[PDB]
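R.M. (postdoc): so does anyone remember the format we settled on? I'll just put the structure tokens first.
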């Protein structure tokens, strides 16, 4: 729902806060960010959100756009409820938020993305909800 100019501005500022060279190694124009997988690729600094591994920018068609809170529970199809991951099977269980195993190993990177304004507090709260009960 974010306009391509607003999407480019959010990525450029967040990548700058990370000190990342991903925009230098993979240049992109604002209109290209209308693709949700490519937009999530830069929002995550080319990293998987559920596994400690890189995302291959040429393999985006093979990756999954996973809903943090499953759509059978929450009616939210925005970026605030989505991540790009190599396989949505790596989220843990399918009928819940990402598993506590994923939370403990990934929360520090999620925290860094939050401070860099690449995810919202609401998105960080839903990503880590397994360590507070789940659902």
């Amino acid at each position: 729902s974010k306009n391509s100019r607003e999407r480019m501005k959010r990525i450029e500022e967040g990548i700058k806060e990370l000190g990342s060279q991903i925009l230098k190694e993979h240049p992109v124009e604002n209109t290209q960010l209308q693709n949700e997988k490519l937009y999530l690729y830069y929002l995550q600094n080319g990293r998987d959100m559920y596994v400690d591994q890189e995302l291959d920018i040429n393999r985006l068609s093979d990756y999954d756009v996973d809903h943090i809170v499953p759509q059978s529970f929450l009616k939210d199809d925005s970026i605030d409820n989505k991540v790009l991951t190599r396989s949505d099977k790596n989220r843990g269980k399918s009928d819940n938020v990402p598993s506590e195993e994923v939370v403990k190993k990934m929360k520090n990177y999620w925290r860094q993305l939050l401070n860099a304004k690449l995810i919202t507090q609401r998105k960080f709260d839903n990503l880590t909800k397994a360590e507070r009960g789940g659902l």
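R.M.: ...and that's the designed sequence above, right after the tokens. Also worth knowing: The two ends are 26 Å apart (CA to CA). Residues 97 and 129 are 7 Å apart (CA to CA).
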